[PDB]
Design a protein around this ligand. Structure first.
Ligand SMILES: [Ca+2]
Ligand SMILES: [Ca+2]
Lengths: 104, 104
């Protein structure tokens, strides 16, 4: 199944959910420390919320809400696994979507 | 460290976050299938969002947002682990807070 990467940010003056990569494998550089991201692999029962260390509280809350909205918007089941990852606390399964993950 | 159990529900006509148990160990019967719950063990770096199989989309979104609000409200670090559990998909660590967990 093919995953999609979204950015959750209010850096534009309003809270926006935008597509940053249509298909995996993704590049690690796509994850910006100042924002939050949603990695949607809902067709394979998995969504990840990634929270940049420099993302603000509004963005962090919006990213959590957005993961839940995806279940309704894309008609994913209630049993969809949602993983919540702070920047630096990423799991091997999350890293697996990236062609060039380099640990800091 | 001592955990606290909260209910996230709009069954009253408005979205409310209420205390259902001040201290662990909790009773499994406290988890109502029609609502969402937050198990706060933030002092030990762990928060759990539990989503009842019969909870509505508004409650599910509010519970996700609430876990993030707890970090700001209780001054927990950005590295606090947040586990998201659908009813029936509970982890051993979540079950460990209950004196009488009985799998269905
Ligand atoms: Ca930002
Ligand atoms: Ca309800």
């Amino acid at each position: 199944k093919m995953a999609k990467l979204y950015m959750v940010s209010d850096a534009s003056g309003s809270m926006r959910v935008t597509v940053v990569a249509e298909e995996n494998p993704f590049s690690m550089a796509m994850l910006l420390s100042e924002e939050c991201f949603i990695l949607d692999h809902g067709a394979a029962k998995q969504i990840f919320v990634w929270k940049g260390k420099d993302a603000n509280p509004q963005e962090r809350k919006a990213a959590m809400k957005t993961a839940e909205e995806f279940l309704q918007q894309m008609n994913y089941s209630k049993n969809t696994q949602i993983q919540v990852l702070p920047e630096g606390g990423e799991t091997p399964i999350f890293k697996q979507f990236f062609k060039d993950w380099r640990d800091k």
